[PDB]
Amino acid sequence: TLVDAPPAQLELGTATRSGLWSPGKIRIGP
Amino acid sequence: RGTRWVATIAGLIGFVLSVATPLLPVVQTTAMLDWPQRGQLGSVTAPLISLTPVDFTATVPCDVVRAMPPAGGVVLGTAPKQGKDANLQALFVVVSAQRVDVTDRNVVILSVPREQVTSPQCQRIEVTSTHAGTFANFVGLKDPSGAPLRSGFPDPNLRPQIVGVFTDLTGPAPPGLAVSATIDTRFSTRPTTLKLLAIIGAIVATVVALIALWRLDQLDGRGSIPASWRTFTLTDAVVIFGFLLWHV
Amino acid sequence: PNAGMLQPVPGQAFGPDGPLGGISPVGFKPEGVGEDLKSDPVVSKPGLVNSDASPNKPNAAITDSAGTAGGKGPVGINGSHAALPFGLDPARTPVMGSYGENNLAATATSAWYQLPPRSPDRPLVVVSAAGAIWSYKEDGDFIYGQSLKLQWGVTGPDGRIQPLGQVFPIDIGPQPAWRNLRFPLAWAPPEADVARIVAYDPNLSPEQWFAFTPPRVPVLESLQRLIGSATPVLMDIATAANFPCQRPFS
């Protein structure tokens, strides 16, 4: 390990989506 | 004619209920992130597997920068400063001994001389980064003519690759400082009840349609072990032995 | 290539890095050229006549020209220990680049260089350069690099040069090695008798820089008058049916 850093707490929750919802494209390249 | 309406209705139901399952609601689980954490201003680790968040937002008030040593420091990073390609594919808010500057994947989003941010004018450094935008918006100070020192590059391919919120700071949490990312957990869903019902109905209908088609194919005069399935041969012995040996 | 060299307009203000720097280069210095500028490896096509590469594996070879791949030499007139290509004289050719500067944004605009009169046999302005430079290639396509533009300009009735128009270079050679960037004199308006370079490198990657050199209007002559069909030549396999007057060595 480079830096001594403990893992994080993730702040979870739930949300009911649909069959066509999408939050945007995925960054696959420049 | 009573077993011909079954093979019709239970065959159209199992079609309109099965071409409609990949359109029904699901229940996504959504994760977030927010350093500080325990109110102690230390580094953390969050190696996103999609290599990129959905959103990103940093606040970084002005007192944090005003109360730094004459050396630079990294008030806020996303990867460790000494990583392999950390300047690339990460975001830094470096405060070097001559100037403050918000950087990105090898592009200087904003840069301001330090003797200007160290003044009663500046208030915070908003570093939002989302789809179609990576602006830097130093609140307070003004661009020489009229602008409030904003930045640009609306490129949507500028979101930093996150492996943590590593920082060069020690002590209790100063008020105002707040990072927040939104992790792309779009594939981890579970079906609702309105989708389980559709799946069950499609399967039951396509079983009843086949049962009715079977019962319909028997209007000929037939319905309801040969000598081939009863013999054993040297060829069968050889094949079975040569499969069981090769399996091991 | 020391013939034209475009002496600048007299009566301007320079810095301690000569007229190629301008008034205050922010990140450009004479000693700003890398010293290993070879190339990216060219991958061989699978079936290629007259090539002994093996068909079982994909192969990649690295070649470049002579003198255009780095090195060190005598000191110039800026104080640059850079090896210049194409037979350029270090005692008369300034250099200016931004190689090891990955913390700031480099910037420099040179002085006004004086263009010679229009002539049908001097159709080009040439600037030798290295590193990564941005340009289009005859299709609206582009090559990814940094900015170098060579603005035009016209002198009025007195010493008041009005600037007008900036153009992208024509660039064909390998990526980091030295090469000639071309600006035809047909792009220039009928009144454009001075020029000046406009350099700007904002990218902080360690492999983005260009290290240019002053412009010149070359004096060209045919290749048949240079070689002459009487001296021994070594034509390669491809370039031997197009030159039927030059003779190979016996």
Side-chain angles (χ1 to χ4, degrees):
Chain A
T1 50
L2 277 174
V3 175
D4 196 287
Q9 313 163 356
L10 216 54
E11 186 86 27
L12 290 155
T14 183
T16 178
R17 301 311 185 193
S18 174
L20 291 156
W21 165 93
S22 75
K25 293 196 167 187
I26 289 189
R27 198 263 177 204
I28 76 181
Chain B
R1 83 184 315 271
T3 173
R4 303 192 309 112
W5 294 132
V6 174
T8 298
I9 65 184
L12 301 163
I13 283 178
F15 176 73
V16 301
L17 269 183
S18 68
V19 79
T21 69
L23 293 168
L24 293 163
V26 287
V27 175
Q28 185 212 11
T29 189
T30 65
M32 217 180 63
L33 188 147
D34 312 29
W35 171 91
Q37 298 301 13
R38 271 85 64 187
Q40 278 309 129
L41 213 67
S43 317
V44 294
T45 311
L48 312 192
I49 206 175
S50 44
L51 271 63
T52 289
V54 177
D55 286 16
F56 182 79
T57 314
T59 288
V60 192
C62 65
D63 315 299
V64 173
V65 165
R66 266 199 269 280
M68 283 197 85
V74 175
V75 57
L76 191 152
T78 282
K81 192 47 182 175
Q82 61 271 16
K84 191 174 173 187
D85 294 332
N87 297 279
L88 182 41
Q89 68 209 359
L91 182 139
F92 294 97
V93 195
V94 282
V95 194
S96 68
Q98 187 67 42
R99 61 187 179 275
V100 184
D101 48 350
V102 185
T103 324
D104 215 316
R105 324 175 82 115
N106 281 141
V107 306
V108 178
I109 284 173
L110 199 46
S111 159
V112 169
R114 187 175 177 180
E115 68 271 14
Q116 199 176 4
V117 309
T118 299
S119 305
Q121 313 195 330
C122 179
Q123 300 193 238
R124 41 191 193 271
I125 302 169
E126 274 87 333
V127 192
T128 65
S129 175
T130 64
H131 278 269
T134 323
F135 322 115
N137 192 12
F138 292 8
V139 192
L141 319 171
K142 296 268 167 29
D143 192 313
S145 88
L149 285 176
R150 208 160 189 266
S151 159
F153 303 138
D155 205 2
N157 287 0
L158 272 178
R159 272 160 289 155
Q161 158 169 356
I162 294 179
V163 295
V165 192
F166 313 91
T167 188
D168 189 351
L169 291 171
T170 58
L177 186 44
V179 189
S180 177
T182 293
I183 314 181
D184 182 78
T185 83
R186 83 178 68 187
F187 306 112
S188 59
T189 58
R190 76 163 191 92
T192 40
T193 173
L194 206 67
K195 198 170 178 176
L196 283 183
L197 298 192
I199 293 168
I200 289 177
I203 290 176
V204 167
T206 179
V207 172
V208 174
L210 258 56
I211 289 295
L213 189 59
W214 177 79
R215 205 75 180 98
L216 208 56
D217 271 7
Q218 293 182 160
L219 313 181
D220 299 355
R222 304 160 186 82
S224 200
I225 191 61
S228 42
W229 279 270
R230 205 141 72 248
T231 188
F232 198 73
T233 321
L234 194 66
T235 308
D236 306 318
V238 169
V239 171
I240 295 175
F241 175 67
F243 265 105
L244 292 190
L245 183 72
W246 195 253
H247 187 248
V248 187
Chain C
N2 311 277
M5 266 317 297
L6 286 199
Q7 293 304 116
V9 186
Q12 302 181 115
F14 322 128
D17 299 345
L20 188 57
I23 196 53
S24 88
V26 167
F28 280 97
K29 52 191 178 312
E31 319 97 1
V33 186
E35 295 311 346
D36 179 278
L37 325 171
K38 285 282 171 213
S39 277
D40 314 318
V42 167
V43 53
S44 315
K45 298 299 190 176
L48 201 70
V49 176
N50 289 342
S51 159
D52 63 357
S54 167
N56 314 142
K57 306 141 281 183
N59 315 267
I62 298 192
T63 78
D64 211 317
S65 299
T68 79
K72 294 200 168 311
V75 65
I77 51 170
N78 301 142
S80 180
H81 303 287
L84 291 177
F86 305 123
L88 284 162
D89 206 358
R92 282 172 291 170
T93 300
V95 190
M96 179 145 297
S98 84
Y99 163 65
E101 311 202 7
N102 318 328
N103 284 316
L104 80 171
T107 288
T109 81
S110 69
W112 288 112
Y113 291 103
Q114 174 85 257
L115 259 54
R118 292 294 196 275
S119 180
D121 47 349
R122 307 182 77 171
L124 213 63
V125 180
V126 182
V127 169
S128 292
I133 306 168
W134 167 282
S135 51
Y136 310 107
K137 47 173 201 291
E138 77 254 8
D139 312 325
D141 214 8
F142 67 90
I143 320 170
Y144 182 55
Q146 310 298 330
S147 176
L148 203 153
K149 289 183 92 62
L150 197 134
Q151 190 180 27
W152 299 105
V154 53
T155 308
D158 49 317
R160 169 70 194 112
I161 295 163
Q162 174 207 351
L164 50 94
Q166 317 185 19
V167 283
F168 288 86
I170 302 176
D171 176 19
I172 74 173
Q175 178 76 93
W178 287 94
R179 58 209 176 262
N180 300 281
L181 320 174
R182 323 189 166 100
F183 310 90
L185 277 183
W187 290 353
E191 86 294 358
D193 54 357
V194 289
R196 96 173 159 201
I197 317 179
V198 176
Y200 176 58
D201 171 71
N203 189 283
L204 300 196
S205 201
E207 68 271 14
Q208 310 275 129
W209 54 277
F210 39 86
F212 54 94
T213 189
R216 59 188 150 97
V217 184
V219 186
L220 303 164
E221 79 171 3
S222 195
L223 188 138
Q224 179 65 229
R225 287 190 63 255
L226 174 72
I227 300 191
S229 71
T231 69
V233 190
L234 174 55
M235 282 85 74
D236 288 22
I237 302 167
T239 61
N242 308 289
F243 302 83
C245 286
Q246 330 299 324
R247 71 168 193 89
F249 67 91
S250 54

